[PDB]
Design a protein around this ligand. Sequence first.
Ligand code: ATP
Ligand code: ATP
Ligand code: ATP
Ligand code: FUM
Ligand code: FUM
Ligand code: OXL
Ligand code: OXL
Ligand code: OXL
Ligand code: MN
Ligand code: MN
Ligand code: MN
Lengths: 554, 554, 554
Amino acid sequence: HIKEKGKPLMLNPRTNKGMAFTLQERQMLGLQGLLPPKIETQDIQALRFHRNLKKMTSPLEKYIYIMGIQERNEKLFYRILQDDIESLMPIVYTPTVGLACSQYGHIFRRPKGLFISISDRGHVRSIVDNWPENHVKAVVVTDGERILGLGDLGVYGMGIPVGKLCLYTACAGIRPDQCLPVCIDVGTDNIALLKDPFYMGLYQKRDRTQQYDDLIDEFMKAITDRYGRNTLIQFEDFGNHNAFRFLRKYREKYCTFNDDIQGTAAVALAGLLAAQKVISKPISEHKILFLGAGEAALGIANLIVMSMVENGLSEQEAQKKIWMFDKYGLLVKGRKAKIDSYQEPFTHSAPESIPDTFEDAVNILKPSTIIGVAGAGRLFTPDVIRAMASINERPVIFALSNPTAQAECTAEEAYTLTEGRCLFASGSPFGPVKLTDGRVFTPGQGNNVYIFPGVALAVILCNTRHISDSVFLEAAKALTSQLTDEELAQGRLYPPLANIQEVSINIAIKVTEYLYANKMAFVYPEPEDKAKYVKEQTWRSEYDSLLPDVYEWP
Amino acid sequence: HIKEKGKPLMLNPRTNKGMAFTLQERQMLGLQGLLPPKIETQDIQALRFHRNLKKMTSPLEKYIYIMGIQERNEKLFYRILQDDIESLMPIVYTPTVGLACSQYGHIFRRPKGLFISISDRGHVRSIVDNWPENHVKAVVVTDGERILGLGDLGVYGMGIPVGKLCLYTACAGIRPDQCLPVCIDVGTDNIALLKDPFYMGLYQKRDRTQQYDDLIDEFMKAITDRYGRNTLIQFEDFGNHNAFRFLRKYREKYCTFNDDIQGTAAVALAGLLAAQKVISKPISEHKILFLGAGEAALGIANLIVMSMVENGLSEQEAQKKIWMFDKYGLLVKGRKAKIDSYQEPFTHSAPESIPDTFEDAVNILKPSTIIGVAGAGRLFTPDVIRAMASINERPVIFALSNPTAQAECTAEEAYTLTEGRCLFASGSPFGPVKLTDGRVFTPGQGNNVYIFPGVALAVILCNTRHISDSVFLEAAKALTSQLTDEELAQGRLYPPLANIQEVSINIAIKVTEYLYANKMAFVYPEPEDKAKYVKEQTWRSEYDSLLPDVYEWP
Amino acid sequence: HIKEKGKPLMLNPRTNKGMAFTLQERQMLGLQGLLPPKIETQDIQALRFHRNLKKMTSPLEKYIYIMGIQERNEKLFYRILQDDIESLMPIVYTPTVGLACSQYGHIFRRPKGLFISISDRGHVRSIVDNWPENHVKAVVVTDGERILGLGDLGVYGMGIPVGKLCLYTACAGIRPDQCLPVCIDVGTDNIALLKDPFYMGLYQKRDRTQQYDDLIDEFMKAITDRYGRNTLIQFEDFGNHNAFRFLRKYREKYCTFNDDIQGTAAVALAGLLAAQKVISKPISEHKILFLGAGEAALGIANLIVMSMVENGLSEQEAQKKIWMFDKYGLLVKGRKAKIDSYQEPFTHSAPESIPDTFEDAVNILKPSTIIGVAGAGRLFTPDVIRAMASINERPVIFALSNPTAQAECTAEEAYTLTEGRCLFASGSPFGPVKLTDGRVFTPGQGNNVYIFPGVALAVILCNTRHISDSVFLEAAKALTSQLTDEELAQGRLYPPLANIQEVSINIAIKVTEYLYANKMAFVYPEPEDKAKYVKEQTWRSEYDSLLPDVYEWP
Ligand SMILES: Nc1ncnc2c1ncn2[C@@H]1O[C@H](COP(=O)(O)OP(=O)(O)OP(=O)(O)O)[C@@H](O)[C@H]1O
Ligand SMILES: Nc1ncnc2c1ncn2[C@@H]1O[C@H](COP(=O)(O)OP(=O)(O)OP(=O)(O)O)[C@@H](O)[C@H]1O
Ligand SMILES: Nc1ncnc2c1ncn2[C@@H]1O[C@H](COP(=O)(O)OP(=O)(O)OP(=O)(O)O)[C@@H](O)[C@H]1O
Ligand SMILES: O=C(O)/C=C/C(=O)O
Ligand SMILES: O=C(O)/C=C/C(=O)O
Ligand SMILES: O=C([O-])C(=O)[O-]
Ligand SMILES: O=C([O-])C(=O)[O-]
Ligand SMILES: O=C([O-])C(=O)[O-]
Ligand SMILES: [Mn+2]
Ligand SMILES: [Mn+2]
Ligand SMILES: [Mn+2]
């Protein structure tokens, strides 16, 4: 059932079916003549798309084309994504989405999402009231300060929330109409954008006064006021300072989490857990060195500690196995560079000698695992990689910074320089690597896309009010538990991306069972079969009938 | 004043302004938050477009991009076309529009126009009633049987009426909302399309029974019943047989004309009229030979006769100067191949010897003017062109068949082979030609786009009921009268394409003055200054204010 | 926010303000010119209404006029009701609503509510999907078999759910857009209606097959499927058999109650609880005799027992003090007339002699309290009343059957025949009575209107899932606790009807606090101050601004 008929049905991508509108639907809904005589199936439409995509050359050109369908025919858009999520992920998500954002103003055609600028302070609710959908259940918001490892892109960062939410639906079957991408515009410090005639935001530097916090507050209140107190709000790509303080400030008041801190933490742990299964290495022999000490590093470290603790280690001893090296060097007690409360637990007494470079840090500390999360480029140099391979029989190397150009190192560099002995994972995709001896290694992608879709679905379906760290610990376990022995032997630390749909649903199932078992679910009545309940609630890309109910009376 | 507010204003390309909506319009119309904070000018938007277009490679890719804008922001679409009509004409019109039609079903995104199929017989009115616009003033309809010189493309032919109408607006300032592209689908004989899974029409051979004629009758009736008996109906790309009979059948009952017979007839004459001024040749000495004897040849021949008649020659004398050579050879009394009543006046007693090829026809008849209108490819061979150059000092050579691949010959071939002595014109665009002696020749485009926009505007504004042949004779004179002596010397047989807007308006002005003088206009009150009236009535691509009228009460 | 503009805002009674639309709203929303130049306040509008009402003569005429305003200007409709609820209650509610119902098909103008017929079996969800409001929270449904004490009125009974819901808003401030009146039409056994050409329902006798139960099931499921499992569903005026059956069947599965069994039970108990205070009578000396043994009698008796039990008596002891006399006579063990499980607890060993009439029952049993609830007219004859006055110093006499003509006796009869010693209450309104000694007695109205509004508000605000009997016991205490000692001496057994609004809110507050204290509330976060929370959530009749948020950017 839909209230609009005629042309409006075609102009609205949510309802538009193109030539898939049946003859009966066309005649009854006033579309006869507005569409070519041909009646098509979604299959034919999907074929038309794949035929055209194949003739395209640049990833960006493909991004514009596919994302364009989200604004023409929503059902078809998700069908297309669903046909081959693995081959399209690189286009609609990292790394291409990063390219899209850097040139967002140049490729603009139609707006996507909700825009709230600091100039709208005191009027946010009226803006939230302008969103057409009334049953929003999930929001992904960014202020564009830390877009991937690209930095401050301001309003051009909107491409991120839009991308994340496309994955909510494509990966976890979350209803598109229940999702709302939001961009908070308080200005940008990117000088180049301030001089770009195509910039889509306020031409001012970022407002870092109390007005900033107040706007975010008005945003949180406005969203929940209209849609409900348990509306899921996923903070995405906020700067380091703001990311933590907002998480700390709102996690016990609203249903919210930060993808970059918590989502990335879960996927990383999941990979480390998979690696532990292939190496069967002693938790006591684990020495983890982080390249970076921000949102991801701190998030990951904290989840790692929670894991070691549940495994018979004290919080203190677990923390001692973790070191961090930020842009100023190793986090050691008494260093010149600042150390906040979050970093304190991982800041140890300075070792014998103090390293100047990350390479020095690797040789002095002799870590068994190295995790790259500095979003600053190829910091895992060939020498850093060799060091890890000479020190460890099976070194674990994670280059998680996105997009591809910001990655610490490539899959080819890792596998070749370690003679195929490393266990590698990255945030951005790399194809398989073949060494001179003929062995082929398939790098897994430690990207939060394996986590937020499933966690979002569970939280939404259970009407969860708040998200604890343990929820992400569980998602991590749920992710790695899906790896098959065969896949582990392949060098895979994560289930194949081609199966991300089924993987996300299983995660959702495992997390909802966890929520119920820990009194964090508030749905009634409580379904008896959680798995069956989640699977039944998923949105489908198949067209629905728009025919009015017609029948004879006795 | 608009009756819609909110998202719908953005979903409707007619009203959507993208980031050009002012802050007040957004706040008052409920769009705040739905658009990026940025407020843009149409100039910036036009800049964004040209920036992107410049990076594209194939003409079809550009066609898809520009025509896509027509479905997103109509004002911008026409602003873009008006910015540089000359460089985009080859993309939205011939030859690219022919390529677009050939694969219309493959590049399909959104439907454009009204589709009426034979399966809708008896229900055409309900289809016409589904069109959202209430004030249609002009219709361009095709059945796709004779799409340019490409043949039967069926429903894929819809691309033609759409393009013609874009030009109604772009060239003559006719309101887009008053235009209606129509495709009559009675099936198609194109075997390739019948086996094409992306075909957009009925999968059946063309219905050539009484049902066909009845459907066309129902169409005419339905359009005029809803929009008025004086609604302009421009038949476009119909097959030979049908084209003439429908013109004869409806020209005195409805406000209708056939672009291929009459429009093309006027452009051709216009070029011949221009040529006569550059070489000052007495038409008693003009011997014209047509390659083809169909819609265009007969249309052109009839207008030529009318021109010679008003210039002191008897109809008989004028017709004797015209010869035609179709796919069976020279039209001569007593030939085996059929000769209908339209061709009879130009079928003369066989010459001394009967020609086998067009080349033979040229050498035996020794024409001074050769007009290619067979839509069959390069029939004006190098030898044909050489023959015209040896027989005449300044041969007139017209290769009017579209698209480019169907043209009788290129500008390069004509100018070079005649050593720059020919007066050449083509239906499809060719770049300037530079001969070994340094002389540069700029070929004119004798395409009906120089005629239908101006004639359509005059007929619409004058509420004309029927269109006589004389109207096209006048349009032809109006076109050529705009050539300046300096342009004649350039080898220009038509005003520069870059000036098609003002050229179309001036033609419209001359035609309306002609309509009033001949009691064919029915407008009340009758404007005293026709020129001023026409120019004031033209639709503009500048954005209109959508703000409600707000003011204070005393 | 408002998604509509122009004429539609005036055609929708929910938004229409008449001349109360401000100049700014008219100009910005496109209403300028569609309304007289005059700008009016709701005060002036209310005056216009009262001015006209005062000139009317019949109650039904007034009913048609006021109810018509609900379909023209909803805000004004409730403002009017709020101005003088006490004087209008008899018009919009009992007894006039009874008359309206009997002639519903004759006074019909616009339909109100949702209609679901047996002929729609299997298609109920599509009917529910047609209701315009998306946030329904409460439903009052009837099948019209037992409308007041009038019997089977079929679809004409829709007047009841409509009236009841008008009171949800007028008395408890429940949002009108969140209320849905429903009439289930499975036919009617009322012969007169089946021959009435203005009848509004199916022309068939009641379907009492399995199809009936199935339809009600489909109804419950469809309502909750669209609006939520906790949607409040108030059954109203269903026949005896079905009333209990559906209450027992759905009370633990849905959020539902039967107004006639539970609502009436609470208001009656409240009256008795008030009488308790005016005469300080020992519960052991309480001898109660019901005239009737159906929906109301059983409901009231059960609640009375719960009250005595909570006060130191065993269930058995309490039930022993209650006797019932239905149409076949006194409910005694072994009588010929049927006795079901609900009546068994009040069916005692036959007394010395078996009474023929209710009068005999009074003389043989010598009850101290008499409760009339047989919906059969003046069964409390002058002799019955005298018997109660001769047997008791201060007899308690309740004539609860509606409408007025169906009441067991009038207030005049009660007070005069008992010489002002009786404590009287009725379902339908009676004016004050003055005896010959000059004493004035003000009869209270023991009608469930004092209960369902407050209970509905509490259940809705607390998102309560199911309603226990104890909730009605609490509502009863909440109602009576509102009486001041001053009022008790005035013969008051209920707070003044003129204060019904504050009385309902207070009942709503007490019930919500009861729900929270007994883990039956599921709202979060839980408000600290329940009274403040409830009062802040109430819908107000004051016009709201419809102006779009316009403001300057810095
Ligand atoms: N050149 C560098 N060498 C080592 N560490 C660096 C270097 N450059 C930046 N870093 C560190 O990387 C961390 C970035 O933290 P931030 O919170 O900004 O992002 P993040 O969440 O780690 O980002 P990502 O999304 O890339 O994982 C900081 O601790 C910073 O000191
Ligand atoms: N190979 C050929 N050589 C000479 N004449 C040809 C040849 N092929 C086709 N013709 C002629 O060209 C004419 C085409 O007439 P038709 O009515 O189909 O289209 P048209 O409008 O005249 O041409 P165009 O499509 O170029 O505008 C016919 O008279 C046909 O006999
Ligand atoms: N004439 C009568 N004398 C005594 N009892 C009667 C008489 N007529 C009907 N009754 C009884 O009144 C009761 C009516 O029960 P029912 O469930 O139909 O409605 P109710 O909700 O109790 O009545 P109301 O809503 O009018 O107060 C029955 O037990 C019936 O036997
Ligand atoms: O295949 C279709 O009908 C739609 C294609 C698109 O919107 O690109
Ligand atoms: O420049 C714009 O705002 C619109 C571009 C488009 O529709 O392609
Ligand atoms: O910011 C990132 O790199 C991400 O979310 O994957
Ligand atoms: O048909 C054609 O070639 C035209 O209209 O230009
Ligand atoms: O049925 C009744 O009389 C009532 O509900 O008031
Ligand atoms: Mn991120
Ligand atoms: Mn044509
Ligand atoms: Mn009732």
